[PDB]
Design an enzyme around this catalytic site. Structure first.
Site, short mmCIF file in Angstrom:
data_model
loop_
_atom_site.label_atom_id
_atom_site.label_comp_id
_atom_site.label_asym_id
_atom_site.label_seq_id
_atom_site.Cartn_x
_atom_site.Cartn_y
_atom_site.Cartn_z
N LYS A 195 -15.36 -8.43 -6.99
CA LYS A 195 -14.50 -9.22 -7.87
C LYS A 195 -13.74 -10.28 -7.09
O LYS A 195 -13.64 -11.44 -7.53
CB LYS A 195 -13.54 -8.30 -8.62
CG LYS A 195 -12.81 -8.97 -9.78
CD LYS A 195 -11.95 -7.96 -10.53
CE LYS A 195 -11.16 -8.62 -11.65
NZ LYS A 195 -12.05 -9.20 -12.69
N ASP A 196 -13.21 -9.93 -5.92
CA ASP A 196 -12.50 -10.90 -5.09
C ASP A 196 -13.45 -11.92 -4.49
O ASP A 196 -13.07 -13.07 -4.28
CB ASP A 196 -11.71 -10.18 -4.00
CG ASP A 196 -10.54 -9.39 -4.55
OD1 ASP A 196 -10.38 -9.33 -5.78
OD2 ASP A 196 -9.77 -8.84 -3.74
N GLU A 218 5.39 -34.07 -1.60
CA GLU A 218 4.16 -33.58 -2.20
C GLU A 218 4.47 -32.85 -3.50
O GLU A 218 5.58 -32.36 -3.71
CB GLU A 218 3.41 -32.67 -1.24
CG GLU A 218 2.68 -33.40 -0.13
CD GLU A 218 1.35 -33.99 -0.57
OE1 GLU A 218 1.17 -34.23 -1.79
OE2 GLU A 218 0.48 -34.21 0.29
N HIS A 262 0.81 -1.21 0.00
CA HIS A 262 0.00 0.00 0.00
C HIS A 262 0.84 1.27 0.00
O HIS A 262 0.29 2.35 -0.21
CB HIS A 262 -0.94 0.00 1.20
CG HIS A 262 -1.99 -1.07 1.14
ND1 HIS A 262 -2.85 -1.32 2.18
CD2 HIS A 262 -2.30 -1.95 0.16
CE1 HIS A 262 -3.66 -2.32 1.84
NE2 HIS A 262 -3.35 -2.71 0.62
N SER A 270 -0.91 -0.82 -6.16
CA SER A 270 -0.76 -2.05 -6.92
C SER A 270 -0.35 -1.74 -8.36
O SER A 270 -0.58 -0.65 -8.88
CB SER A 270 -2.07 -2.85 -6.91
OG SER A 270 -1.90 -4.10 -7.55
#
Ligand code: HEC
Ligand code: HEM
Ligand code: HEM
Ligand code: HEM
Lengths: 47, 51, 60, 238, 68, 101, 79, 379, 109
Positions: H227-228, H271, H201, H205
């Site tokens: 949107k998220d 894994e 921040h 972004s």
């Protein structure tokens, strides 16, 4: 000159009811708001 | 990093090399003391009494 | 002649409290109906395989 | 070189298909009458059969049919009890060393997770049980070993456990080797995944809910973003 | 009456199939080779595996219809 | 050089910023020198750059492209920022060289 | 810090917008999306696909070579 | 009067972080994964907590406790497989997020990128120890191999390995250590993520164009909150598919047998999200060299900002750099596939070539190609 | 130029919290306990964590694990009793802190 600027046409986005320029929006405001809020309410019910 | 390839930085290094060397000794003595290396502490006259 | 959605907005969706009450009641009834329908679909797909379909042959 | 098991059309391999609980009951009969003598299922109790293939009274009758060692009594020495549905399936041997001694140094694995512990699962188990064959020319098996092409190394210490009429099914189904193998593999799949049917039902419910929700949340996002996606910007320098 | 299991029938049904047949004849050839020699180390496990793979593929496709 | 000109034009077309109406200097990464050069741009050039960048952002938001005839032509692409950036970098180099002494 | 009050200086830019309740959420969704999706795919395919095609070729060749290596070699048993 | 959302301290922080945050309007779906990561983290805590209410970190009861969770606890199977597959989803989102950062030049946020590298290492350690927790055959032997890797360190390797083990090998002490560390680490991850967002921040972004978007900023809330939410819904769809239709797809069957210190499983592989590193580790015959290569495989992200030589930030306008990036992605997929595969004739050479290509692309090919593009653009 | 302590984000937070925070010049020793609480908390987090490396939460192995910590783990008794008495110190400091808040009218915050 701030007067030669005209809002570009949005007809290719406007909903069907508000397409006519001579017909008031208050006639179908409830319908459009109810459609969108019904989508929202069904989404909230599922969530 | 050619910005630092100048005579002044060469002088700047020489001014701070003794200080950096001293701090390195502090780190070396600290590491030996903290870890009880005993490869180095065997040489130390009084500390070698332990182990 | 208001449409169905206009009636819905005027009665329920306009005020947020009534909106939330409609959402809660709809959630209750939707949970009941959706569970019933999904159970019916699942049991029809697996008809004759589930225990509830064969338990009668062993109940007493 | 190793042989991979074929993909048999199990009735539970469907996307939303459950298990045949009649097959589960037959497979449990196979387990209690064939492999219980050497194999164990530590993590399966009789109470686990109440809602799957046996009613509660039938499960109690099954539990009472086998004696179980109970805790110390007043004298302080262990005793035997008829058994209850809270008990787990009895161990054929006390400790793994006893099992190895009784099975020529080979430990019969626990069958509670066998279908979940082997690559291929019930396919591998079914191919192994019915796949016993006469060793091909050049194969020399040590004493007490049997040739199974699907077992790694092709030399398995388990003698062919199932055959025609090995057990008499209560349901009356013909006890062919294939039928017994299929039923026991279905039961072992249930043992490995006791939540199979519930998981399938929840998956169906979640598929329906997601098919309902994703378009709706997408429509909400489009409704919010319509302001920006229809936005017309003009540049008007003087 | 001896309760003939469907497995034998289905395995026999494959054994008359081009894959099953060609694998079986190659297995026969390998068997003859191994038997003929005296101290050879080769094994017929590989060709047997080919045959069993084809046959068990066919059996997987056919068998479960007969089983109850 | 003609082959060099051809490959440069091909790469300019391949780099699709012209498809957004942008110019080459709009895509430059705004580091300290670029920030100073932008701050030294005359008002008309700065306003044109800001509008072009905003229009490109709007186009990329909708995943759309400018009409075929509105793409910036390679031969009429103007390197407006280049002189200012060159001067800024020259000044920075002079300051660093003085610091070296 | 960085706040909507003061981020950058912009002049003489006019943005016209519409209320979400005055416009359709999915306007010309298919008739415009499908050509646009095709355009984006045509633009990006030559850049994205070839590495994955090469990977698939390498994967198939490696699997085949490993399977062949596991296979018996007749020449080892000539005698 | 004032607005509580703008004046109250906690409300100030929340508003400036998630409500009134100026966000670029053109950021694509690749910017969702960040938030997705957070969701995964939150899930991995919640689910994880409800696994700790029944799990006991004792060698005599760990496997039995896991079977109790998956056999007796109400909806215990749901929680357990949500955890297991949510770890894989976490690493999918992590890989996609790092790829987004590499592609769009987001690494120019130096502090954010470095905190992200630290987060990646912490998450990898957490997932490793969590996988050791069930104490199956796979857990025990993967822990054995990975911890034994540390023995390659010169002059302190044995002592460090035996200190981490809490003994002479992987045993009950190691299991309890790993349970405690696995419990505690995700909260450190949350703190690091808070610091990460704090650093992000500071400059806002990035965006697909790689151009500063201060002229086109929108409020984060009305647009990117929904949107998220949609992105989280899609991620939850994928995760629930994996948990309700193929709960054992990404796992290994050999982890359903209790740990046997005297009998290795047929194959020992970690894994999937570690396989690529494992593959690189197996390329170098030398143990110390293999460990160093494995560490550098992740530390190269630190060098990534310094290797940036192009005049443009994002790869959106650099087709040759895009080709190199997709070659790198295919190479990572190759490394994962080989790490799955055994150590035999073709796999060894393909893995060596793949590791060489990975380091070559990240170190040599990309800066040179960026310089070539700069010369092609006449700057 | 600037000052890293007063410019860097994390450094800004730390400087404004514990370095350049304006504090009353006359706060007595009763204002120490606050920091003490934090100290105690950190201690309980560290010490407790090292107890979690040997403690198992099964009724068949809980008491035995605690005795294993107290008898077999190197300096395990030190850590165990540090935890046990640090909880008591935490509560002593908490009660003194609440008493300080009541006495000096600190509840007006
Ligand atoms: C003769 C005693 C005996 C009988 C009866 C028996 N088993 Fe076993 N089983 C064994 C032994 C011994 C092994 C391990 C042999 C080895 O590892 O070499 C084994 C192994 C297995 C394996 C494969 C384990 C592996 O590692 O591949 C399966 C599957 C299995 N048993 C299931 C069954 C089923 C199902 C039945 C009932 C049809 C059954 N067993 C009956 C003794 C028995
Ligand atoms: C980023 C966060 C986390 C990651 C990546 C992660 C990863 C994992 C993984 C991969 C497993 C293996 C599960 C299996 O194979 O069955 C596991 C197990 C486990 N984790 Fe975590 N985990 C995280 C957070 C947590 C938290 C916060 C807790 C507790 C508060 C926790 C507690 C457990 C427990 C008890 C197990 C063993 C239970 C089981 O295996 O089913 N985890 N974890
Ligand atoms: C638990 C791990 C992580 C969490 C919770 C997390 C969280 C976030 C969030 C919420 C964002 C904002 C959304 C976005 O910009 O996409 C973000 C952005 C970012 N993250 Fe992460 N992240 C994690 C791991 C990483 C890693 C591994 C890296 C790099 C190796 C990284 C580097 C970045 C960068 C550079 C940005 C800014 C992207 C841009 O502005 O274009 N993060 N992170
Ligand atoms: C404010 C923080 C904490 C307080 C007030 C607290 C308090 C206590 C108390 C009173 C006991 C009883 C000890 C005894 O009777 O012998 C205890 C035991 C224990 N605590 Fe803590 N604790 C805290 C934090 C933690 C943390 C953060 C952990 C782990 C990360 C932890 C792990 C343990 C364990 C494993 C035990 C059992 C070991 C033993 O009883 O000797 N505690 N705690």
């Amino acid at each position: 000159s701030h007067t030669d600027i005209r809002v570009p046409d949005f007809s290719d986005y406007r909903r069907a009811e508000v397409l006519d320029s001579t017909k008031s929006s208050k006639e179908s405001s409830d319908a459009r708001k109810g459609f969108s809020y019904l989508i929202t309410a069904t989404t909230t019910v599922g969530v | 990093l050619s910005r630092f390839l100048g005579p002044r930085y060469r002088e700047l290094a020489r001014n701070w090399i003794p200080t950096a060397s001293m701090w390195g000794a502090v780190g070396a003595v600290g590491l030996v003391w903290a870890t009880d290396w005993r490869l180095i502490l065997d040489w130390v006259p009084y500390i070698n009494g332990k182990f | 002649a208001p449409t169905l959605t206009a009636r819905l907005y005027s009665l329920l969706f306009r005020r947020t409290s009534t909106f939330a009450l409609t959402i809660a009641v709809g959630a209750l009834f939707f949970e009941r109906a959706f569970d019933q329908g999904a159970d019916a679909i699942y049991e029809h797909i697996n008809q004759g395989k589930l225990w509830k379909h064969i338990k009668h042959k062993y109940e007493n | 070189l190793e042989l991979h098991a074929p993909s048999y059309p199990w009735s539970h391999r469907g996307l939303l298909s459950s298990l045949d609980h009649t097959s589960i009951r037959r497979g449990f009969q196979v387990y209690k009458q064939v492999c219980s003598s050497c194999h164990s299922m530590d993590y399966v109790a009789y109470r686990h059969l109440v809602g799957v293939c046996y009613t509660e009274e039938e499960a109690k009758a099954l539990a009472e049919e086998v004696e179980v060692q109970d805790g110390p009594n007043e004298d302080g020495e262990m005793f035997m009890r008829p058994g209850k549905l809270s008990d787990y399936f009895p161990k054929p041997y006390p400790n793994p060393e006893a099992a190895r001694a009784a099975n020529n140094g080979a430990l019969p694995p626990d069958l509670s997770y066998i279908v979940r512990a082997r690559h291929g699962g019930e396919d591998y188990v079914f191919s192994l049980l019915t796949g016993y064959c006469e060793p091909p020319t050049g194969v020399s098996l040590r004493e007490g070993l049997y040739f199974n092409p699907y077992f790694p190394g092709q030399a398995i210490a388990m003698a062919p456990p199932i055959y025609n009429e090995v057990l008499e099914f209560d349901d009356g189904t013909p006890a062919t080797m294939s039928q017994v193998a299929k039923d026991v593999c279905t039961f072992l799949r249930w043992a490995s995944e006791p939540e199979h049917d519930h998981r399938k039902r929840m998956g169906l419910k979640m598929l329906m809910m997601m098919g309902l929700l994703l378009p709706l949340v997408y429509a909400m996002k489009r409704h919010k973003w319509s302001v920006l996606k229809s936005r017309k910007l003009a540049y008007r320098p003087p | 009456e001896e309760l003939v299991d469907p497995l034998t029938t289905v395995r026999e049904q494959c054994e008359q199939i081009e894959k099953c047949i060609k694998a079986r004849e190659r297995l026969e050839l390998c068997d003859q080779r191994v038997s003929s020699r005296s101290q050879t180390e080769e094994d017929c496990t590989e060709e047997l595996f080919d045959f069993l793979h084809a046959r068990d593929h066919c059996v997987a496709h056919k068998l479960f219809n007969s089983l109850k | 050089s003609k082959w060099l000109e051809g490959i440069r034009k091909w790469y300019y077309n391949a780099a699709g910023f012209n498809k957004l109406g942008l110019m080459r200097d709009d895509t430059i990464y705004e580091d300290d020198d670029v920030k100073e050069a932008i701050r030294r741009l005359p008002e008309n050039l700065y306003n044109d750059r800001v509008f072009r960048i905003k229009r490109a952002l709007d186009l990329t938001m909708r995943q759309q492209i400018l009409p075929k005839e509105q793409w910036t032509k390679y031969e009429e692409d103007k390197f407006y920022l280049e002189p200012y950036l060159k001067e800024v970098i020259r000044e920075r180099k002079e300051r660093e060289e003085w610091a070296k002494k | 810090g960085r706040e909507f009050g003061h981020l950058t200086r912009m002049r003489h830019v006019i943005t016209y917008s519409l209320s979400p309740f005055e416009q359709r959420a999915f306007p010309h969704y298919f008739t415009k999306g499908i050509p646009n999706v095709l355009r984006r795919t045509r633009a990006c395919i030559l850049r994205v696909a070839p590495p994955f095609v090469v990977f698939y070729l390498v994967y198939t060749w490696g699997t085949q070579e490993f399977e062949k290596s596991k296979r018996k070699n007749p020449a080892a048993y000539e005698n | 009067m004032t607005n509580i959302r703008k004046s109250h301290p906690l409300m100030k922080i929340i508003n400036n972080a998630f409500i009134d945050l100026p966000a670029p309007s053109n950021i694509s779906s690749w910017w969702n994964f960040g938030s997705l990561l957070g969701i995964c983290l939150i899930l991995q805590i919640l689910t994880g907590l409800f696994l700790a209410m029944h799990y006991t970190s004792d060698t005599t009861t760990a496997f039995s406790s896991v079977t109790h969770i998956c056999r007796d606890v109400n909806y215990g199977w749901v929680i357990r497989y949500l955890h297991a597959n949510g770890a894989s989803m976490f690493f999918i989102c992590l890989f996609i997020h790092v790829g987004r950062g590499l592609y769009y030049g987001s690494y120019m946020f130096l502090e954010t990128w470095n905190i992200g590298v630290v987060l990646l290492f912490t998450v990898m350690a957490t997932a490793f120890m969590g996988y050791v927790l069930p104490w199956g055959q796979m857990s025990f032997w993967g822990a054995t191999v990975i911890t034994n890797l540390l023995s390659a360190i010169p002059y302190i390797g044995t002592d460090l390995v035996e200190w981490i083990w809490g003994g002479f090998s992987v045993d009950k002490a190691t299991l309890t250590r790993f349970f405690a560390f696995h419990f505690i680490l995700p909260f450190i991850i949350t703190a690091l993520a808070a610091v990460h967002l704090l650093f992000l921040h500071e400059t806002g972004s990035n965006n697909p164009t790689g151009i500063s978007s201060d002229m086109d900023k929108i409020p984060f809330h009305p647009y990117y909150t929904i949107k998220d939410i949609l992105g989280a819904l899609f991620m939850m769809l994928i995760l629930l598919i994996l948990v309700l239709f193929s709960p054992d797809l990404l796992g290994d069957p050999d982890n359903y047998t209790p740990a046997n210190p005297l009998n290795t499983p047929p194959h020992i592989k970690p894994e999937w999200y570690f396989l690529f590193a494992y593959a690189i580790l197996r390329s170098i015959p030398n143990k110390l060299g293999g460990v160093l290569a494995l560490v550098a495989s992740i530390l190269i992200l630190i060098l990534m900002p310094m290797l940036h030589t192009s005049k443009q930030r994002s790869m959106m306008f650099r087709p040759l750099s895009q080709c190199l990036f997709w070659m790198l992605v295919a190479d990572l997929i190759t490394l994962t596939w080989i790490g799955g595969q055994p150590v035999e004739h073709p796999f060894i050479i393909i893995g060596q070539l793949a590791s060489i290509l990975y380091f070559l692309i990240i170190l040599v090919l990309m800066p040179i190609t960026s310089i070539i593009e700069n010369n092609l653009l006449k700057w």
